[PDB]
Amino acid sequence: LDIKKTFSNRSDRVKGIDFHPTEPWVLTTLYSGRVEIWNYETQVEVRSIQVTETPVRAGKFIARKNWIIVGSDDFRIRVFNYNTGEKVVDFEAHPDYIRSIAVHPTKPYVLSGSDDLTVKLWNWENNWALEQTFEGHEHFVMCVAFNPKDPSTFASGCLDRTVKVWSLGQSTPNFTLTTGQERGVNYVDYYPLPDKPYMITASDDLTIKIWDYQTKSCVATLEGHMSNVSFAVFHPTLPIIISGSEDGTLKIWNSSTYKVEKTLNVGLERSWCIATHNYIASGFDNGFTVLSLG
């Protein structure tokens, strides 16, 4: 763990962030309605768009289509071609805020999680048709993520203090995880490797929890953040967990011992979002930062 500072820049509050898989680019989506795509090696903006006047809380690359997809508090999903800058689709996806967007790794599917208490599946090869609504949660759906080892299933994290895991094509959850994080679930992520059936959740109750999704048990609890924990993720290649919080810090936890290894206060106020490519990137109140670990 030699943490090197690749590229930071100040901006309005960064609510979403994503790495491009083949280009050295980071996408940020801002509370001001702007999105930015930065080449973090050369430190030049590849493209910027004033998408709306409302916060844009969710954004992802869809690399195989040369798109970004974003979702904003104006209720709308929009898709832009990052090479030409042109908007390719623009539709009202939910009658409320869009918190989270996930892209299926091999099929033309996108999920959106909303304050309307639902997750919705859209198919871009079927004219962006609504293919299914997953109803069940009792509060805002804050995060949605496919299972990378089985993307026919996905998890939703919700302020109703639960995580629900669903199968595409089925109306009810495969199971519902009672987190015990009584201030709600802000984020949910899968561990990517096949040796552990692990998921991780972050909460305003200052805890981070690891879950065995076969037995539905809590494997460990990571404590130490001083304020709401906005996200927690497994690193794809390093045996570490990365979290960020409104206490202004990133924390890197040992993924074997579940103990904190490093606490980074990057000086940009509250942390809100995370991406991993050993690059990681995080979005904050006052900008973003791209960090190399090895």
């Binding site: 509050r13 509370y31 918190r99 304050d115 509060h139 805002f140 804050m142 302020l159 802000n186 509250r270």
Partner: peptide
């Protein structure tokens, strides 16, 4: 609302 920031 709840999580507006």
């Amino acid at each position: 609302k709840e999580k507006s920031d």
